[PDB]
Amino acid sequence: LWEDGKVQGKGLKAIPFSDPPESLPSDMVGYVGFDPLGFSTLFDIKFLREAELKHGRAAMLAAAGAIAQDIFTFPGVTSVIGDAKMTGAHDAFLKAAADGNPKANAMSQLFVWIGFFELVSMPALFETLNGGERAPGDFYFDPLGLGKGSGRARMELAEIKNGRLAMIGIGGMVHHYLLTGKGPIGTI
């Protein structure tokens, strides 16, 4: 899409009666003119976009993983964490780690590796904030060559929109679990 005048950018205004802040860029992908509380004025839009993309990717992964964990579990994980769903699985793995069971260090391994990636990527954020070549979210990770050329603009807008949707959806899932104790599929 990248419909500069249709789905994002330029006169696009989420709130007709109130104009967007001056700091918010209309060239950024996903710009609907939405920033009523003026967070862009307080904080660098590069930092905010980095945060938005990181959050959207993490939430998309979390929602897909919630659905996948509800529909299927890997061979053997039931032995180690009984029957646990969503954050219950996280707590179960940590409790087994404390109990001393090996095969129960999945969360520790996840933290180690994700933190390694974040620590080695932390410099990228600093370079972006220092006026570097890198765009806020671009990690240059396109091995399959899926998003290149024309697609790029549809791919970035789809990424941002699906990321926001997943941000909402994972919160919904987690709170539904906290209340009902069920999973994504269980609830519906």
């Binding site: 802040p21 009523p36 509380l37 003026g38 967070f39 004025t41 307080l42």
Partner: protein
């Protein structure tokens, strides 16, 4: 020539009435000696601190965060109860905020009290901006006075402001 606040006394030389919140009140002449921009910034910062302090002296008496439900409705007792870790986190947050003030005071020039914080864009209209500047100054002054009174009332009665008002122990029994 004559001060507005004190009609029988000559207007202070530095206070000509143009700056916000100026009524020519300086009986002891602080403005003659100390830098007027620094004084204005200090006044604004004190007013903001005390506005928040006056609000927070009474808010816990109406509602408390679930984590701090046990803490006393007396703000001083709650301060004693909070504990080193929470106070350290508050101190770090305040120091991070004050780093911007440090930069604006020692390595920058700007309107006194202007740290760029206007997320809701309420200060764009010049007339509303002038009213808001004077209102901020005056509410800060009132909050300074009120919060000093509140701290001393809590020292005396060992209770919150609303609790003191309701129990009507308005009068002291001596030094604590």
């Amino acid at each position: 020539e004559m001060s507005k606040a004190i009609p029988f006394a000559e207007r202070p030389a530095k206070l000509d009435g143009k700056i916000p919140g100026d009524v020519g009140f300086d009986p002891l002449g602080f403005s003659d000696y100390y830098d007027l921009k620094y004084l204005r910034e200090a006044e604004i910062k004190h007013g903001r601190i005390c506005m928040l302090g006056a609000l927070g002296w009474l808010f816990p008496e109406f509602a408390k965060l679930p984590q701090f439900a046990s803490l006393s409705t007396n703000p001083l007792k709650a301060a004693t109860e909070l504990g080193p870790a929470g106070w350290a986190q508050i101190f770090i947050f305040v120091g991070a905020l004050e780093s911007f003030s440090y930069e604006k005071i020692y390595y920058g020039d700007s309107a006194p009290g202007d740290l760029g914080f206007d997320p809701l864009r309420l200060g764009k209209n010049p007339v509303s901006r002038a009213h808001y500047e004077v209102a901020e100054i005056k509410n800060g002054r009132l909050a300074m006075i009120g919060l000093g009174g509140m701290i001393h009332h809590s020292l005396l009665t060992k209770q919150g402001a609303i609790e003191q008002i309701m129990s009507q122990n308005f009068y002291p029994s001596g030094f604590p």
